Amino acid sequence: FVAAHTSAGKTVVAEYAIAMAHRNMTKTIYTSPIKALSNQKFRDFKETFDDVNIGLITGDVQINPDANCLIMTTEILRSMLYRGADLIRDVEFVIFDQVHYVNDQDRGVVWEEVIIMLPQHVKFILLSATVPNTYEFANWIGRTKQKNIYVISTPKRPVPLEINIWAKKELIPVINQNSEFLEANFRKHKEILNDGPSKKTWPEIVNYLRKRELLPMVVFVFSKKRCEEYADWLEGINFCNNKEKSQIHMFIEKSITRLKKEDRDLPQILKTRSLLERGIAV
RNA sequence: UUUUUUUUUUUUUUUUUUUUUUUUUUUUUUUUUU
Ligand SMILES: Nc1ncnc2c1ncn2[C@@H]1O[C@H](COP(=O)(O)OP(=O)(O)OP(=O)(O)O)[C@@H](O)[C@H]1O
């Protein structure tokens, strides 16, 4: 059982498990609560491993069912166990990623049933983040399956984070990398300021951070409509000089070939293409 | 105003003909128009 901070390198354990299974000529099953992550992990594993066949089993697709490495959803595994598939006899490792996202009601019963129904020759690898309820999951699994499981945790984040506040064309650091609040900086922030964004607000930020070599930016707006307005407010700003635009255009043109000819003229596609040529997206 | 994609089961034909069942009897010479 591994419970480490985010961006600490949890995927190294899964890669080593897959390599061990390939060396022993056994099978591995990878499972995630969310179907969105399955495709991304499938692509990542296909790129990373060249001597190992990778498969995918979801409610929409089914690629290489006979491969030695399979990525599927929890309900797919539940149905497979209920049917009594013959490939389970060769499975050595089952990996559950993002365990801390399974504390829901619909996601909870299927996970417990899958854990209960698994045979005794299968070993477990568990990955998640730091959550208050960590020892209980491991204890329950080790009691139900009567197996030895080790709980491994990390002290702190390998990369540190800081919290700042922006006000009137400069940035005030108020929490440092040690998670210690700075009262004087907050007081100065209160003093210097003595509603919503304006039309000349996002340009005032896309230039200050650009000159500081901190360009890669993700802005969180809690509204579908406000994001489009904010993106449209950024006018006369570009990040592709002459070849990045051509490469992006080629990638977009090749990608949307799978659609029909009259389905590529939709306004959303045109607006996204126009925005993507300058390095801005929603 | 963020957040929400749900869809159950089955495999390759029973063996020996046509028959296919009820109310009681008689007597000695051609041809046409009559
Ligand atoms: N010991 C290490 N030293 C240097 N780099 C490392 C080390 N371990 C992992 N990395 C790098 O970390 C990068 C990404 O880390 P990773 O994706 O595993 O974080 P994570 O914990 O899985 O995030 P999440 O919470 O989303 O699951 C990898 O590309 C890897 O090169």
Tab-separated table of C-alpha atoms (C1' of nucleotides) and ligand atoms in Angstrom:
chain	number	residue	atom	x	y	z
A	1	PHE	CA	0.000	0.000	0.000
A	2	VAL	CA	1.480	3.340	-1.104
A	3	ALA	CA	0.074	6.652	0.176
A	4	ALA	CA	2.377	9.432	-1.034
A	5	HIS	CA	1.881	13.072	-1.960
A	6	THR	CA	0.946	14.113	-5.483
A	7	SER	CA	3.651	14.312	-8.165
A	8	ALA	CA	5.946	12.068	-6.118
A	9	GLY	CA	6.363	9.210	-8.606
A	10	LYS	CA	3.732	6.609	-7.754
A	11	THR	CA	3.611	5.252	-11.321
A	12	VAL	CA	7.137	3.829	-10.925
A	13	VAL	CA	5.721	1.040	-8.739
A	14	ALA	CA	3.197	0.004	-11.400
A	15	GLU	CA	5.852	-0.045	-14.132
A	16	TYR	CA	8.074	-2.267	-11.987
A	17	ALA	CA	5.140	-4.601	-11.317
A	18	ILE	CA	4.450	-4.869	-15.057
A	19	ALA	CA	8.133	-5.588	-15.715
A	20	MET	CA	8.121	-8.288	-13.024
A	21	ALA	CA	5.035	-9.900	-14.558
A	22	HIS	CA	6.639	-9.832	-18.012
A	23	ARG	CA	9.779	-11.474	-16.616
A	24	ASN	CA	7.678	-14.157	-14.889
A	25	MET	CA	5.400	-14.542	-17.957
A	26	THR	CA	2.255	-13.743	-15.949
A	27	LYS	CA	-0.603	-11.263	-16.407
A	28	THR	CA	-1.355	-7.857	-14.885
A	29	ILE	CA	-4.646	-5.952	-14.613
A	30	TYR	CA	-4.847	-2.169	-14.183
A	31	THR	CA	-8.056	-0.551	-12.933
A	32	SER	CA	-9.193	3.042	-12.404
A	33	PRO	CA	-12.472	4.387	-10.980
A	34	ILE	CA	-12.914	6.907	-13.825
A	35	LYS	CA	-13.224	5.857	-17.466
A	36	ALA	CA	-11.548	9.105	-18.569
A	37	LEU	CA	-8.173	8.076	-17.125
A	38	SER	CA	-8.205	4.630	-18.760
A	39	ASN	CA	-7.502	5.947	-22.269
A	40	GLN	CA	-4.722	8.261	-21.073
A	41	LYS	CA	-3.045	5.484	-19.093
A	42	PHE	CA	-3.426	3.129	-22.068
A	43	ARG	CA	-1.633	5.611	-24.326
A	44	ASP	CA	1.088	6.222	-21.728
A	45	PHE	CA	1.724	2.502	-21.216
A	46	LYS	CA	1.728	1.822	-24.960
A	47	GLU	CA	4.343	4.547	-25.423
A	48	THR	CA	6.439	3.433	-22.438
A	49	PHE	CA	6.523	-0.338	-23.049
A	50	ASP	CA	7.636	-1.813	-26.378
A	51	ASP	CA	8.071	-5.520	-25.550
A	52	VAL	CA	4.780	-5.816	-23.611
A	53	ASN	CA	1.406	-6.124	-25.333
A	54	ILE	CA	-1.173	-3.699	-23.918
A	55	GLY	CA	-4.931	-4.156	-24.050
A	56	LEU	CA	-8.008	-2.135	-23.161
A	57	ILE	CA	-11.487	-3.291	-22.116
A	58	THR	CA	-14.172	-0.655	-21.548
A	59	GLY	CA	-17.889	-0.250	-22.183
A	60	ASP	CA	-17.117	1.321	-25.577
A	61	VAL	CA	-14.034	-0.477	-26.947
A	62	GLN	CA	-12.158	-3.767	-26.625
A	63	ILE	CA	-8.578	-3.877	-27.947
A	64	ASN	CA	-6.312	-6.958	-27.762
A	65	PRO	CA	-8.212	-9.048	-25.174
A	66	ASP	CA	-5.455	-11.698	-25.270
A	67	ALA	CA	-2.624	-9.348	-24.269
A	68	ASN	CA	-0.595	-9.927	-21.113
A	69	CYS	CA	-1.318	-6.396	-19.812
A	70	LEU	CA	-4.956	-5.313	-19.558
A	71	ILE	CA	-6.490	-1.975	-18.572
A	72	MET	CA	-10.181	-2.016	-17.681
A	73	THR	CA	-12.836	-0.516	-15.416
A	74	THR	CA	-13.951	-1.897	-12.064
A	75	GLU	CA	-17.381	-2.953	-13.342
A	76	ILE	CA	-15.761	-4.789	-16.264
A	77	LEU	CA	-13.678	-6.769	-13.766
A	78	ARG	CA	-16.804	-7.422	-11.681
A	79	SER	CA	-18.661	-8.841	-14.686
A	80	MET	CA	-15.589	-10.859	-15.689
A	81	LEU	CA	-15.366	-12.412	-12.216
A	82	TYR	CA	-19.096	-13.180	-12.246
A	83	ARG	CA	-18.726	-14.923	-15.611
A	84	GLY	CA	-15.720	-16.897	-14.341
A	85	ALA	CA	-13.170	-16.059	-17.026
A	86	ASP	CA	-10.227	-18.390	-17.595
A	87	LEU	CA	-7.630	-15.600	-17.820
A	88	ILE	CA	-7.936	-14.919	-14.077
A	89	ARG	CA	-5.930	-18.084	-13.356
A	90	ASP	CA	-2.806	-16.478	-14.879
A	91	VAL	CA	-3.134	-13.075	-13.175
A	92	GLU	CA	-0.333	-12.275	-10.726
A	93	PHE	CA	-0.919	-8.584	-9.909
A	94	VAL	CA	-4.004	-6.369	-9.769
A	95	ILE	CA	-3.367	-2.626	-9.446
A	96	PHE	CA	-5.921	-0.136	-8.118
A	97	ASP	CA	-5.050	3.489	-8.868
A	98	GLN	CA	-6.743	6.516	-7.282
A	99	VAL	CA	-8.180	4.584	-4.345
A	100	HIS	CA	-9.117	7.798	-2.505
A	101	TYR	CA	-11.710	8.541	-5.222
A	102	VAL	CA	-13.703	5.369	-4.445
A	103	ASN	CA	-15.320	6.607	-1.208
A	104	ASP	CA	-18.576	7.351	-3.075
A	105	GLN	CA	-21.816	5.354	-2.894
A	106	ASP	CA	-21.955	4.020	-6.461
A	107	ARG	CA	-18.172	3.504	-6.561
A	108	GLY	CA	-18.019	1.829	-3.145
A	109	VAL	CA	-20.075	-1.341	-3.495
A	110	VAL	CA	-18.442	-2.535	-6.731
A	111	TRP	CA	-14.927	-2.040	-5.347
A	112	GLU	CA	-15.745	-4.035	-2.204
A	113	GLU	CA	-17.394	-6.813	-4.222
A	114	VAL	CA	-14.381	-7.035	-6.544
A	115	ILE	CA	-12.033	-7.208	-3.552
A	116	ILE	CA	-14.143	-9.934	-1.930
A	117	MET	CA	-14.537	-12.101	-5.042
A	118	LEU	CA	-10.863	-12.173	-6.067
A	119	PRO	CA	-9.042	-15.539	-5.755
A	120	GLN	CA	-6.184	-16.275	-3.354
A	121	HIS	CA	-3.295	-16.405	-5.861
A	122	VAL	CA	-3.558	-12.700	-6.790
A	123	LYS	CA	-1.394	-10.049	-5.127
A	124	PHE	CA	-2.436	-6.422	-4.712
A	125	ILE	CA	-0.880	-3.022	-5.400
A	126	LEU	CA	-2.714	0.049	-4.091
A	127	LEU	CA	-1.973	3.687	-4.944
A	128	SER	CA	-3.696	6.832	-3.666
A	129	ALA	CA	-3.014	10.155	-1.940
A	130	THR	CA	-2.734	11.059	1.745
A	131	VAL	CA	-6.199	10.594	3.270
A	132	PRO	CA	-7.322	10.310	6.924
A	133	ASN	CA	-8.767	6.813	6.344
A	134	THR	CA	-5.725	4.869	5.130
A	135	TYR	CA	-4.914	2.150	7.674
A	136	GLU	CA	-8.521	0.921	7.713
A	137	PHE	CA	-8.565	0.023	4.005
A	138	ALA	CA	-5.308	-1.930	4.283
A	139	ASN	CA	-6.428	-3.656	7.483
A	140	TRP	CA	-9.747	-4.681	5.925
A	141	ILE	CA	-8.040	-6.042	2.806
A	142	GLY	CA	-5.413	-7.937	4.806
A	143	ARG	CA	-8.093	-9.377	7.081
A	144	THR	CA	-10.498	-10.451	4.327
A	145	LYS	CA	-7.809	-11.945	2.080
A	146	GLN	CA	-5.462	-13.014	4.923
A	147	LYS	CA	-2.441	-11.515	3.166
A	148	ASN	CA	0.520	-9.444	4.320
A	149	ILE	CA	0.376	-5.847	3.074
A	150	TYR	CA	2.835	-3.040	3.841
A	151	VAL	CA	1.761	0.602	4.177
A	152	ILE	CA	4.317	3.054	2.765
A	153	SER	CA	4.011	6.836	3.071
A	154	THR	CA	6.101	9.891	2.108
A	155	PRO	CA	7.074	12.743	4.464
A	156	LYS	CA	6.438	15.769	2.241
A	157	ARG	CA	5.973	16.979	-1.318
A	158	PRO	CA	9.116	16.528	-3.459
A	159	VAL	CA	8.361	19.895	-5.113
A	160	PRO	CA	7.215	22.745	-2.828
A	161	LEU	CA	4.280	25.076	-3.372
A	162	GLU	CA	3.774	28.717	-2.418
A	163	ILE	CA	0.659	30.884	-2.152
A	164	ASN	CA	0.632	34.476	-3.408
A	165	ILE	CA	-1.910	37.283	-3.767
A	166	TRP	CA	-2.167	39.619	-6.769
A	167	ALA	CA	-3.303	43.225	-6.345
A	168	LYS	CA	-2.664	46.344	-8.457
A	169	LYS	CA	-0.015	45.079	-10.889
A	170	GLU	CA	2.293	43.133	-8.558
A	171	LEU	CA	2.432	39.833	-6.678
A	172	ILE	CA	2.687	39.572	-2.883
A	173	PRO	CA	4.074	36.311	-1.424
A	174	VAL	CA	2.040	35.561	1.695
A	175	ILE	CA	2.764	31.859	2.286
A	176	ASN	CA	6.257	30.458	1.719
A	177	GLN	CA	7.368	26.907	0.868
A	178	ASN	CA	7.184	25.857	4.544
A	179	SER	CA	3.416	26.526	4.809
A	180	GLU	CA	3.971	29.372	7.282
A	181	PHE	CA	1.634	32.353	7.021
A	182	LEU	CA	3.167	35.824	6.634
A	183	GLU	CA	1.036	38.430	8.406
A	184	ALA	CA	3.067	41.482	7.351
A	185	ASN	CA	2.598	40.757	3.644
A	186	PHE	CA	-1.166	40.381	4.090
A	187	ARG	CA	-1.258	43.649	6.041
A	188	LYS	CA	0.625	45.379	3.219
A	189	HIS	CA	-1.842	43.858	0.740
A	190	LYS	CA	-4.711	45.317	2.767
A	191	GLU	CA	-3.005	48.722	2.915
A	192	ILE	CA	-2.154	49.005	-0.791
A	193	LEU	CA	-5.766	48.370	-1.862
A	194	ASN	CA	-6.878	51.467	0.080
A	195	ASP	CA	-15.824	43.062	-7.743
A	196	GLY	CA	-14.947	41.262	-10.961
A	197	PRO	CA	-12.273	41.319	-13.653
A	198	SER	CA	-12.166	44.169	-16.147
A	199	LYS	CA	-11.489	44.137	-19.884
A	200	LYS	CA	-7.860	45.122	-19.156
A	201	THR	CA	-7.202	42.575	-16.393
A	202	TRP	CA	-6.092	39.345	-18.099
A	203	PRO	CA	-3.727	41.232	-20.443
A	204	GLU	CA	-2.281	42.774	-17.268
A	205	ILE	CA	-1.378	39.254	-16.097
A	206	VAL	CA	-0.420	37.490	-19.358
A	207	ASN	CA	2.477	39.955	-19.741
A	208	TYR	CA	3.799	40.189	-16.172
A	209	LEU	CA	4.195	36.412	-15.896
A	210	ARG	CA	5.501	36.080	-19.463
A	211	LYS	CA	8.584	38.199	-18.716
A	212	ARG	CA	9.289	36.204	-15.527
A	213	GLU	CA	9.703	32.906	-17.446
A	214	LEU	CA	6.688	31.407	-15.646
A	215	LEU	CA	4.451	31.242	-18.708
A	216	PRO	CA	2.625	27.845	-18.429
A	217	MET	CA	-0.658	28.916	-16.861
A	218	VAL	CA	-3.967	27.285	-15.936
A	219	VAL	CA	-6.810	29.586	-14.857
A	220	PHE	CA	-9.801	28.105	-13.026
A	221	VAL	CA	-13.131	29.833	-13.711
A	222	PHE	CA	-16.270	28.266	-12.232
A	223	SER	CA	-18.518	29.036	-15.211
A	224	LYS	CA	-18.792	27.650	-18.742
A	225	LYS	CA	-19.751	31.024	-20.233
A	226	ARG	CA	-17.196	33.153	-18.361
A	227	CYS	CA	-14.250	31.153	-19.731
A	228	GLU	CA	-15.171	32.010	-23.326
A	229	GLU	CA	-15.538	35.707	-22.485
A	230	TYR	CA	-12.186	35.733	-20.678
A	231	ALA	CA	-10.485	34.047	-23.637
A	232	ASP	CA	-12.081	36.482	-26.094
A	233	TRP	CA	-10.895	39.431	-23.993
A	234	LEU	CA	-7.299	38.406	-24.809
A	235	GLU	CA	-6.701	40.095	-28.168
A	236	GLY	CA	-3.410	40.616	-29.976
A	237	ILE	CA	-1.467	38.000	-27.993
A	238	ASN	CA	0.429	35.144	-29.637
A	239	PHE	CA	2.903	32.426	-28.691
A	240	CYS	CA	3.566	30.658	-32.032
A	241	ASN	CA	6.015	32.404	-34.352
A	242	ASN	CA	5.947	30.627	-37.732
A	243	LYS	CA	6.285	26.822	-37.378
A	244	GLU	CA	4.312	25.991	-34.238
A	245	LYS	CA	1.191	27.316	-35.962
A	246	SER	CA	1.820	25.108	-39.003
A	247	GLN	CA	2.438	22.033	-36.840
A	248	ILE	CA	-0.745	22.654	-34.835
A	249	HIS	CA	-2.699	23.179	-38.061
A	250	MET	CA	-1.412	19.884	-39.472
A	251	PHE	CA	-2.225	18.049	-36.232
A	252	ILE	CA	-5.764	19.465	-36.136
A	253	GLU	CA	-6.362	18.717	-39.820
A	254	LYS	CA	-5.204	15.109	-39.454
A	255	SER	CA	-7.073	14.503	-36.188
A	256	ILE	CA	-10.548	15.575	-37.346
A	257	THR	CA	-10.357	13.539	-40.547
A	258	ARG	CA	-12.377	10.767	-38.866
A	259	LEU	CA	-15.464	13.009	-38.901
A	260	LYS	CA	-17.635	13.531	-41.958
A	261	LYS	CA	-16.927	16.432	-44.295
A	262	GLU	CA	-19.985	18.490	-43.325
A	263	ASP	CA	-19.345	17.918	-39.597
A	264	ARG	CA	-16.004	19.779	-39.651
A	265	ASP	CA	-17.644	23.181	-40.281
A	266	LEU	CA	-19.265	23.497	-36.853
A	267	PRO	CA	-18.651	26.908	-35.214
A	268	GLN	CA	-17.058	25.343	-32.124
A	269	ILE	CA	-14.413	23.585	-34.229
A	270	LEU	CA	-13.626	26.791	-36.131
A	271	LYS	CA	-13.312	28.864	-32.955
A	272	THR	CA	-11.130	26.228	-31.279
A	273	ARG	CA	-8.891	26.071	-34.358
A	274	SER	CA	-8.561	29.863	-34.450
A	275	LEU	CA	-7.694	29.992	-30.745
A	276	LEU	CA	-5.292	27.030	-30.827
A	277	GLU	CA	-3.101	28.704	-33.467
A	278	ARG	CA	-2.094	31.322	-30.864
A	279	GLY	CA	-1.599	29.094	-27.810
A	280	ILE	CA	-4.929	29.817	-26.081
A	281	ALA	CA	-7.589	27.208	-25.330
A	282	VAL	CA	-10.597	26.589	-23.094
B	1	U	C1'	-23.936	27.970	-11.456
B	2	U	C1'	-19.747	24.068	-10.827
B	3	U	C1'	-20.924	18.769	-10.881
B	4	U	C1'	-24.044	13.838	-13.727
B	5	U	C1'	-22.467	8.519	-20.456
B	6	U	C1'	-26.736	4.655	-18.569
B	7	U	C1'	-27.204	-0.551	-22.277
B	8	U	C1'	-29.676	-9.535	-19.951
B	9	U	C1'	-29.235	-15.541	-21.650
B	10	U	C1'	-29.224	-20.828	-25.583
B	11	U	C1'	-25.742	-24.512	-31.581
B	12	U	C1'	-25.177	-30.595	-36.420
B	13	U	C1'	-33.793	-34.096	-37.688
B	14	U	C1'	-38.583	-40.022	-32.661
B	15	U	C1'	-37.520	-46.742	-36.608
B	16	U	C1'	-41.020	-50.657	-40.808
B	17	U	C1'	-47.231	-49.371	-47.068
B	18	U	C1'	-51.521	-49.096	-50.390
B	19	U	C1'	-57.511	-54.293	-48.938
B	20	U	C1'	-59.026	-48.891	-44.726
B	21	U	C1'	-66.721	-54.136	-46.005
B	22	U	C1'	-74.912	-54.248	-43.791
B	23	U	C1'	-81.683	-54.195	-44.544
B	24	U	C1'	-84.523	-59.496	-48.872
B	25	U	C1'	-84.896	-62.711	-56.817
B	26	U	C1'	-88.233	-65.029	-61.947
B	27	U	C1'	-91.411	-67.504	-67.053
B	28	U	C1'	-91.654	-69.927	-75.542
B	29	U	C1'	-91.707	-66.125	-83.884
B	30	U	C1'	-87.627	-60.297	-88.437
B	31	U	C1'	-88.784	-54.553	-90.288
B	32	U	C1'	-91.678	-49.590	-91.136
B	33	U	C1'	-96.172	-46.602	-90.305
B	34	U	C1'	-100.081	-47.198	-86.950
C	1	LIG	N1	12.702	9.320	-8.014
C	1	LIG	C1	12.460	10.262	-9.090
C	1	LIG	N2	13.381	11.151	-9.429
C	1	LIG	C2	13.182	12.021	-10.409
C	1	LIG	N3	12.050	12.036	-11.090
C	1	LIG	C3	11.066	11.171	-10.810
C	1	LIG	C4	11.244	10.254	-9.796
C	1	LIG	N4	10.127	9.513	-9.717
C	1	LIG	C5	9.287	9.945	-10.640
C	1	LIG	N5	9.839	10.945	-11.306
C	1	LIG	C6	9.230	11.673	-12.387
C	1	LIG	O1	7.774	12.231	-11.944
C	1	LIG	C7	7.159	12.418	-13.042
C	1	LIG	C8	5.615	12.286	-12.847
C	1	LIG	O2	5.361	11.804	-11.560
C	1	LIG	P1	3.954	10.986	-11.299
C	1	LIG	O3	3.080	11.067	-12.527
C	1	LIG	O4	4.253	9.539	-11.008
C	1	LIG	O5	3.171	11.656	-10.016
C	1	LIG	P2	1.774	11.064	-9.378
C	1	LIG	O6	1.957	10.841	-7.897
C	1	LIG	O7	1.433	9.756	-10.048
C	1	LIG	O8	0.563	12.154	-9.625
C	1	LIG	P3	-1.037	11.840	-9.386
C	1	LIG	O9	-1.436	12.293	-8.002
C	1	LIG	O10	-1.848	12.590	-10.414
C	1	LIG	O11	-1.297	10.361	-9.525
C	1	LIG	C9	7.677	11.281	-13.974
C	1	LIG	O12	7.822	11.742	-15.246
C	1	LIG	C10	9.025	10.881	-13.402
C	1	LIG	O13	10.099	11.088	-14.440
